[PDB]
Design a protein around this motif. Structure first.
Motif, PDB file in Angstrom:
ATOM      1  N   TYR A 118       0.805  -1.214   0.000  1.00  0.00           N
ATOM      2  CA  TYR A 118       0.000   0.000   0.000  1.00  0.00           C
ATOM      3  C   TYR A 118       0.839   1.266   0.000  1.00  0.00           C
ATOM      4  CZ  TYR A 118      -3.803  -3.110   1.263  1.00  0.00           C
ATOM      5  OH  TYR A 118      -4.727  -4.118   1.290  1.00  0.00           O
ATOM      6  N   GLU A 119       2.098   1.195   0.416  1.00  0.00           N
ATOM      7  CA  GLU A 119       2.938   2.374   0.533  1.00  0.00           C
ATOM      8  C   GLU A 119       3.801   2.620  -0.691  1.00  0.00           C
ATOM      9  OE1 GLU A 119       3.724   4.532   3.405  1.00  0.00           O
ATOM     10  OE2 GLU A 119       1.782   3.920   4.204  1.00  0.00           O
ATOM     11  N   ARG A 120       3.676   1.802  -1.731  1.00  0.00           N
ATOM     12  CA  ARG A 120       4.302   2.096  -3.017  1.00  0.00           C
ATOM     13  C   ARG A 120       3.406   3.032  -3.827  1.00  0.00           C
ATOM     14  NH1 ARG A 120       6.833  -3.558  -5.281  1.00  0.00           N
ATOM     15  NH2 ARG A 120       8.221  -2.139  -6.413  1.00  0.00           N
ATOM     16  N   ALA A 121       3.154   4.210  -3.266  1.00  0.00           N
ATOM     17  CA  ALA A 121       2.215   5.147  -3.855  1.00  0.00           C
ATOM     18  C   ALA A 121       2.610   6.559  -3.456  1.00  0.00           C
ATOM     19  CB  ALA A 121       0.784   4.839  -3.418  1.00  0.00           C
ATOM     20  N   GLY A 122       1.880   7.526  -3.984  1.00  0.00           N
ATOM     21  CA  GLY A 122       2.035   8.915  -3.613  1.00  0.00           C
ATOM     22  C   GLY A 122       2.722   9.729  -4.694  1.00  0.00           C
TER      23      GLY A 122
END
Lengths: 110, 50, 250
Positions: free
Chosen positions: C79-83
């Motif tokens: 989920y944190e491979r974003a932004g």
């Protein structure tokens, strides 16, 4: 139709309510009133009110306020609804908000 | 009906069988007539209050 | 579109590497080619089941309710491979999709996905049985970063107020429809008869859309105003008067 109004006042009030149009005799020749003056006692008042209640055709019992002042025990024990009972004022003592049995349940909401 | 409760109220079916018709035609006219008008209206109003 | 299809009879190790291929491709696209990427991952619960299988193959003792003790870190590395990032003109937006086992909101998978993500959309079953598509329940749903996405220069200056008023009117209409069942429909106010037409019109005209019907944001907001013009201007309490002047009289 199925029920009649009924009075307990004095001679002047029962005649006023006959002029209004209420006042009736039983098939036993019992009236829808019991006139009270300096003659009769309160035991008669209270058993008259009792046979007024238990009579299963009376809906609206009017009672002059100054009559009910000492038989508050007879009418405060009344807790049902359809034997409606209204205390009435007149010139001797007009309407007093204190000695009411239907403003009895309005404690606080004044 | 109020929220499912059945409050009982009164209907005033007006009957007519007036017995007080003599009432001294020549002894007491408009006086007693307006008197019984007043007291009949009062009877109905106290029916409402009951 | 780049489609990665993993089936239920495929090897259960490929289900572990499917979202990592998807996110590697997404990172290439967004941070080296400067596109705006949206990544949709369907049934993370199946991913969790495959994770449990490959964990038990290592002879590891199960964790709380079946799933490994390190499931938080494994979901977080996805989920944190974003932004957005500084110096590049591309983004990555993620939309995980889950099925809650037993319709429970405290199962490990929904519960841990709530600690990493920002908001949630709810697909409801009472709205699905009433034959509404899409069956989205807007009262429990939330977007934690809506304040940043909307407004002047991004969608339109009336977005936040229209959304707040639609939410308020919808909740009030639901309460009114609750009271209607015990009080009776003949003993309702005239302002409670408006919160019951808004309900039908909102669920059948705003929520219910159609599987091949594309509504831009401005069409959505115009539908919102067509629904808000049921109430007199004096009942819309959450819309400032400087906007009730420009968009209400139409």
């Amino acid at each position: 139709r199925g029920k009649l109004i009924a009075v307990i006042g004095d001679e002047d009030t029962v005649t006023g309510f006959l002029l209004g149009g209420i006042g009736e005799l039983n098939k036993n020749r019992h009236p829808n009133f019991l006139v009270v003056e300096k003659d009769t006692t309160i035991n008669e008042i209270e058993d008259t009110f009792r046979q007024f209640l238990n009579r299963d055709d009376i809906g609206i019992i009017l009672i002059n306020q100054y009559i009910a002042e000492m038989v508050r025990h007879a009418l405060d024990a009344h807790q049902q609804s359809i034997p409606a009972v209204l205390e009435i004022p007149s010139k001797e003592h007009p309407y007093d908000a204190a000695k009411d049995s239907i403003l009895r349940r309005a404690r606080g909401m004044f | 009906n109020v929220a499912g409760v059945t409050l009982p109220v009164f209907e005033h079916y007006h009957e007519g069988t007036d017995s007080y018709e003599l009432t001294g035609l020549a002894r007491g006219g408009e006086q007693l007539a307006k008197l019984k008008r007043n007291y009949a209206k009062a009877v109905e109003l106290l029916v409402e209050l009951a | 579109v780049c489609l990665f299809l993993n089936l239920a009879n495929d090897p259960t190790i490929e289900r572990i590497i499917t979202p990592r291929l998807a996110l590697t491709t997404a990172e290439f696209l967004a941070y080296q080619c400067e596109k705006h990427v949206l990544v949709i991952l369907t049934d993370m619960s199946s991913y969790a089941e495959a994770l449990r299988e490959v964990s038990a193959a290592r002879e590891e003792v199960p964790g709380r309710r079946g799933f490994p003790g390190y499931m938080y870190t494994d979901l977080a590395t996805i989920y944190e491979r974003a932004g957005r990032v500084e110096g590049r003109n591309g983004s990555i937006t993620q939309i995980p999709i889950l099925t809650m086992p037993n319709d429970d909101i405290t199962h490990p998978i929904p519960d841990l996905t709530g600690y990493i993500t920002e908001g949630q959309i709810y697909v409801d079953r009472q709205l699905h049985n009433r034959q509404i598509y899409p069956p989205i329940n807007v009262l429990p749903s939330l977007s934690r970063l809506m304040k940043s996405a909307i407004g002047e220069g991004m969608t339109r200056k009336d977005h936040a107020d229209v959304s707040n008023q639609l939410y308020a009117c919808y909740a009030i209409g639901k309460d009114v429809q609750a009271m209607k069942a015990v009080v009776g429909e003949e003993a309702l106010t005239s302002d409670d008869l408006l919160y019951l037409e808004f309900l039908q019109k909102f669920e059948r005209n705003f929520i219910a859309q159609g599987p091949y019907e594309n509504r831009t944001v401005f069409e959505t907001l115009d539908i919102g105003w067509q629904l808000l013009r049921i109430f007199p201007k004096e009942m819309l309490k959450r819309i400032p008067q400087s906007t009730l002047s420009e968009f209400y009289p139409r």
